[PDB]
Design a protein around this ligand. Structure first.
Ligand SMILES: [Zn+2]
Lengths: 25, 101, 213, 136, 67
RNA sequence: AGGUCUCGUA
RNA sequence: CCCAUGAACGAGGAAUUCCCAGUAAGUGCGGGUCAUAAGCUUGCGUUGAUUAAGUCCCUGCCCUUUGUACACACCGCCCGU
RNA sequence: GCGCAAGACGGACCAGAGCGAAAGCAUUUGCCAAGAAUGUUUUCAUUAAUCAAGAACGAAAGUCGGAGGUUCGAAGACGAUCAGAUACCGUCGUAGUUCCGACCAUAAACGAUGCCGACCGGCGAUGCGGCGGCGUUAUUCCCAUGACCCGCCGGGCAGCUUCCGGGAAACCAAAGUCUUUGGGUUCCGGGGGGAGUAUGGUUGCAAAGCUGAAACUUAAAGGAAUUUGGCGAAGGGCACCACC
């Protein structure tokens, strides 16, 4: 696992967390 | 570790060079790093030369020469056997290859 | 089923008297069937013949374009339309360690024949020169280009096309530019690598029949 | 059906364009003006095999056929113009140019001036493919 | 072709290295006995010495490498 | 007056 | 050992083996195996010439340079659901 | 083969050559403004170097509003390779690739080397300006100027060699003048993951940008260079158990 795709997946996870918090909180 | 004193190119005080396209491939590579090959070639090599020469309308005629320049990416340049790997101290030699034919 | 070549003709094209060889070749044209005139398919024809096959003994890597303007009968008449250089010659002239100077001038002759003449020049190395580059300053290049532009525009507006074509048979303009540029930077060869015909006046018959002797 | 003038006076001239790519060979004979032609014979009609369209054999056979037709009509001498793919991809004529020229000149024809008419551009658009090129 | 040539005999005054995938062809510089001016490189099969006379059907084909 | 001018070989 | 019955075999596909001077091969004779014992093997004799004085194309092996995140060493090492 | 229309673009000339603070910059010409270096027996006389706050610019991708959409081409549609490909490959192909604005402020934005100043070896080239000197050339004479050659001076991108010196080494006239350790001044590193994560602030329509931990877990993770190891790397040699 190289750094670039790992960072992309972490960005996707952060986006999911932000979206869920914004639609829930 | 660093292999060459330069960075595999000739850019020393520019920071950017025009990008060109490979001939064998379609890869876009920097100009000074892309190996450039200039070839001088005739229309016919050794087979149709007689057929053109003796069977011709005009006499005392010099055959035309086709002119073209080649750009080769590193992978395409090595896969076509234009350049080959050398020794650690042999890579510092910048002399051009001998030409006698 | 049927060969169209039975309904075909043959015409021989002629060259202007300002050249040596009068014949060029024979062209096949469909016979006049219906209301379609055969001569209508004889006007827009361009011949990329070399000057060797058009003059007795001269440079063989120069080419000219000839356009047909009228046909009398079984014999087509042409006119000057342009001039180009051999692609191999142009490829071989452009080499390394020398600066190429380009210049296009849109200058009209005495009559309404507007031409866009192009020029090519190179610098070379003196017999005792050691510097391998032998480049030129930008201001020197600009001065050379201005000199070439002035030389070409001077030898066009003062005369008609009929004899400046003869002037174009040798490199008289090229030699004049070469001699005029000895003071800025010594160039070796000056070639008018391309001549286009942008505009032509109203079609005329007397000038055409005077051109062919 | 035949030549308009005597078979002993002079040679009747016509121009032939040989277009050769890495996958086909084109042989085309026309008049000096280039407007009206005689015949068009290419290696894509002789050999019924696409993978073998660009081959010395197909070019040779096409050149022989076009030369036979040219001799049948009555044109004696040809001015040959080579042309590669041009555009922006390659400038080298395909394998069929060499064999086609040798065949059509060995048929008994006469060859005059040779000129390259490949459409080399001063500056074209972006070449087909990605930034990393076509890797196989 | 419409080209008929006489059968020419040449003298092999020098043998060079053997060319080919398996070395089955040698390269020699022939020498026409009638014309002591031209030195043409021609390939010949079989064993040849320096001084034998060959039989060149055509005197213009200069032999190239493998292909 | 005579009729393949001299030395080596991509 | 003697008599008689007389098939395939009409010079052999893909593929593949050995070899260059007294040589393969044709030919026969010994020792070992043996109370009965040579279609095997090892030697021995006799007749006998061509194909080349080379190469790295194929099948393999061996050195130099080059790259390495591998040292039980690519049957290595190692990333993710 | 001849003409027309539209968009992008500036090959060969093009170089370990030039300019710009960096990103970056190529068809001719016209206009406007700016700058480094060289020359100076002109002018002011400490006006100086680096920098918390703050401020301009900032490749392509990224978003918003217009105009155009030639070519290439995310997503998508289709066909073969494949055991399996929604990958390599081939044909179409929206958004974008183009310009005018309004935004983000990100790279292997690398010389992976901050700036100013002094000193310590040599040798040829190249680009600028100045200076001295034979000789050819713009035809033969006289001068100024270009072009050529022989040197010198200053700044700039670089090149070659070496027991100046240094470093773990690769290597470096700087990565030197450093235990015989102090020229001036900014940013920043403290074993490897967790983690550039959650959180709080902050800017942005958004994408995301700056600041940025802890709990738990490991004795290793790493830098340079040799001998065998293997390559679907290159180049050589030999063998009738290889070939012709
Ligand atoms: Zn390539």
């Amino acid at each position: 696992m190289r750094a670039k795709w790992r960072k992309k997946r972490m960005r996707r996870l952060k986006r999911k967390r932000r979206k869920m918090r914004q639609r829930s909180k | 570790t660093k292999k060459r004193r330069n960075n595999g190119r000739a850019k020393k005080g520019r920071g950017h060079v025009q990008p060109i396209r490979c001939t064998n491939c379609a890869r876009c590579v920097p100009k000074d790093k892309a190996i450039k090959k200039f070839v001088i070639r005739n229309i016919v090599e050794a087979a149709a030369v007689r057929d053109i020469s003796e069977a011709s309308v005009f006499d005392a005629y010099v055959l035309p020469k086709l002119y073209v320049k080649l750009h080769y990416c590193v992978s395409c340049a090595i896969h076509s056997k234009v350049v080959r790997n050398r020794s650690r101290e042999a890579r510092k030699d910048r002399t051009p290859p001998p030409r006698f034919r | 089923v049927v060969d169209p070549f039975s309904k075909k003709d043959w015409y021989d094209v002629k060259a202007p008297a300002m050249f040596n060889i009068r014949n060029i070749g024979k062209t096949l044209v469909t016979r006049t069937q219906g209301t379609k005139i055969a001569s209508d398919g004889l006007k827009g024809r361009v011949f990329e013949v070399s000057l060797a096959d058009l003059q007795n003994d001269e440079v063989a890597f120069r080419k000219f374009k000839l356009i047909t303007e009228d046909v009398q009968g079984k014999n087509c008449l042409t006119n000057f339309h342009g001039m180009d250089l051999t692609r191999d010659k142009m490829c071989s002239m452009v080499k390394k360690w020398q600066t190429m100077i380009e210049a296009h001038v849109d200058v009209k002759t005495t009559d309404g024949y507007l031409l866009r003449l192009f020029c090519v020049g190179f610098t070379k190395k003196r017999n005792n020169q050691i510097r391998k580059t032998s480049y030129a300053q930008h201001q020197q290049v600009r001065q050379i280009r201005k000199k070439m532009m002035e030389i070409m525009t001077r030898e066009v507006q003062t005369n008609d096309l009929k004899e400046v074509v003869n002037k174009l048979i040798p490199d008289s303009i090229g030699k004049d530019i070469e001699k005029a540029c000895q003071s800025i930077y010594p160039l070796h060869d000056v070639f008018v690598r391309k001549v286009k015909m942008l505009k032509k006046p109203k079609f005329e018959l007397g000038k055409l029949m005077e051109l062919h002797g | 059906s035949l030549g308009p003038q005597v078979a002993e006076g002079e040679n009747v001239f016509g121009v032939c364009h040989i277009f050769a790519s890495f996958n086909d060979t084109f042989v085309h004979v026309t008049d000096l003006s280039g407007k009206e032609t005689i015949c068009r014979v290419t290696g894509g009609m002789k050999v019924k095999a696409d993978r073998d369209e660009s081959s010395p054999y197909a070019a040779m056979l096409a050149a022989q056929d076009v030369a036979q037709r040219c001799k049948e009509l009555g044109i004696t001498a040809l001015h040959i113009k080579l042309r590669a793919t041009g555009g922006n991809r390659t400038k080298t004529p395909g394998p069929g140019a060499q064999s086609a020229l040798r065949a059509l000149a060995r048929s008994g024809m006469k060859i005059g001036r040779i000129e390259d008419v490949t459409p080399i551009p001063s500056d074209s658009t972006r070449r087909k493919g990605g930034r990393r090129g076509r890797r196989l | 072709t419409s080209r008929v040539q006489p059968i020419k005999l040449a003298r092999v005054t020098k043998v060079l290295g053997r060319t080919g995938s398996q070395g089955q062809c040698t390269q020699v510089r022939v020498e026409f006995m009638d014309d002591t001016s031209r030195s043409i490189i021609r390939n010949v099969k079989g064993p040849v010495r320096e001084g034998d006379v060959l039989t060149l059907l055509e005197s213009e084909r200069e032999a190239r490498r493998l292909r």
